[PDB]
Design a protein around this ligand. Structure first.
Ligand code: NI
Length: 341
C-alpha cells in the first residue's frame, strides 16, 4: 500500500506514488524527477493529473508516451495554485528537471518535499528564505558521517585533465563513459568539449538527451559513432569483457580504452583524496570509478537542515530497517541540540 511518507497531510496530494494503483483520496500526483524508482507505474494509460517540471513533462510525453492532456508542467520559482492549494517548484540540484516542492496548506502549515537533492548554500537564497517551514520530507540517501565526497567541480577537473592527457599521449585512444539514467551529463559533455569531439550514443539515449533543454545540445551529441571519440554505453557494459567487445566493433580505429564509471559513493572515499584516484587496468583497457554525486553528502545535508530549522523531519530514503531509522533520528536530534532549535 502507499506509504505515509508519500502523502501530503491536509491535501489530496501524493509525491512519487505511481506504483500503488489508484491511491484513495488522491486528486493530484506530483513527480519530482524522471528516475525509474520514482516514476514506476506511469504509462500512456495513466488518466490522472501529473504535476512536474517542463523537462520532466518532456520525458513523460516522449519516453513514456503519457498523453499530453494529463501532463501539467509548472514553471520554477513561481507561486502556482493546484486544486486550491499554493505550491512552488524549486531546483533540487539533482538530475535535469528535478525539483523540490513547497506546499502552503490552508491551515498555515508550510511543508517542503526535497524529492532527491544535493543540498547547496545557494538554496539558502531561494524563495525558501522568505517563510518558516514546519515539516521537511528529506532525501536521506547519505545520512551518515562516513559519506564525504568532493565537489562536482573537483571531480570534473580530474576527469577532463585525465582524458586530455591520455588522448594527447595516444591519439588512437577511445574514451567511454557509462550511464543508466538521466543525470551526470557534465561528465561526458566536459570530456568531449576538451577533446573537440561530439559524444556518440544510441538512438534511445540521444532521444532522452534531446528532451532536457540543455543549450547548444545539437552541437555536443550525435548518433554517428564513427565520427566521435567519446562513446556512451550502458553502465552494465563498463567492465573488461564489455569494453574488449566494444573495441572489436570499432574496426581498428582505436587501440586503447580509457573508461569512466561515475558511481555515487564508494569506501575508497574514507581514505582516498580525488588527486589520488587510480584505475583498474587490464591490458590496453583502464576503468576509473569517480565519485560524482547528485545527492547531498552528510555535511551538506546537515548544513541545510540546521539552516532551515524544521519542526519535524520525515525521511524518504533508508526507511526500510529499524537500525537505519533509529540512526537517522539520532542524527536529527544532535543537529537540533547543536543549533538550538
Ligand atoms: Ni533520483
Amino acid at each position: 500500500t502507499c506509504p505515509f511518507y508519500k502523502k501530503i497531510p491536509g491535501t489530496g496530494f501524493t509525491v512519487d506514488a505511481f506504483q500503488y494503483g489508484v491511491v484513495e483520496g488522491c486528486t493530484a500526483y506530483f513527480l519530482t524527477h524522471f528516475h525509474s524508482d520514482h516514476y514506476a507505474g506511469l504509462s500512456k494509460h495513466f488518466t490522472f493529473p501529473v504535476y512536474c517540471s517542463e523537462i520532466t513533462g518532456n520525458l513523460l510525453k516522449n519516453k513514456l508516451h503519457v498523453q499530453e492532456q494529463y501532463i501539467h508542467p509548472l514553471p520554477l520559482d513561481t507561486e502556482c495554485i493546484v486544486n486550491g492549494v499554493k505550491v512552488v517548484l524549486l531546483d533540487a540540484n539533482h538530475c535535469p528537471g528535478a525539483v523540490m516542492i513547497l506546499f502552503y496548506l490552508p491551515n498555515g502549515t508550510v511543508i517542503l518535499h526535497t524529492g532527491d537533492f544535493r543540498a547547496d548554500p545557494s538554496m539558502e537564497r531561494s524563495l525558501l528564505a522568505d517563510q518558516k517551514v514546519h515539516m521537511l520530507y528529506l532525501d536521506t540517501t547519505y545520512c551518515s558521517p562516513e559519506y564525504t565526497f568532493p565537489s562536482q567541480q573537483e571531480v570534473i577537473r580530474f576527469a577532463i585533465n585525465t582524458a586530455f592527457e591520455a588522448v594527447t599521449l595516444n591519439p588512437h585512444a577511445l574514451v567511454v563513459c557509462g550511464t543508466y539514467s538521466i543525470g551526470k551529463e557534465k561528465v561526458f559533455l566536459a570530456i568531449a568539449d576538451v577533446l573537440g569531439s561530439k559524444v556518440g550514443m544510441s538512438q534511445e539515449k540521444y532521444k532522452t538527451l534531446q528532451c532536457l533543454n540543455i543549450p547548444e545540445i545539437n552541437s555536443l551529441i550525435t548518433t554517428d559513432m564513427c565520427s566521435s571519440l567519446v562513446h556512451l554505453l550502458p553502465m552494465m557494459q563498463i567492465n573488461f569483457k564489455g569494453l574488449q567487445s566494444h573495441l572489436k566493433k570499432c574496426g581498428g580505429k582505436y587501440n586503447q580504452i580509457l573508461a569512466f564509471r561515475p558511481t555515487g559513493w564508494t569506501h575508497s572515499n574514507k581514505f582516498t583524496r580525488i588527486a589520488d584516484v587510480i584505475p583498474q587496468t587490464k591490458g590496453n583497457i583502464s576503468i576509473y570509478g569517480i565519485p560524482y554525486s547528485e545527492h547531498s553528502s552528510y555535511l551538506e545535508m546537515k548544513r541545510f537542515v540546521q539552516w532551515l530549522k524544521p519542526q519535524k523531519i520525515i525521511p524518504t530514503v533508508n526507511v526500510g530497517t529499524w537500525k537505519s531509522r533509529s540512526t537517522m533520528e539520532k542524527y536529527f536530534r544532535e543537529w537540533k541540540l547543536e543549533a538550538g532549535y
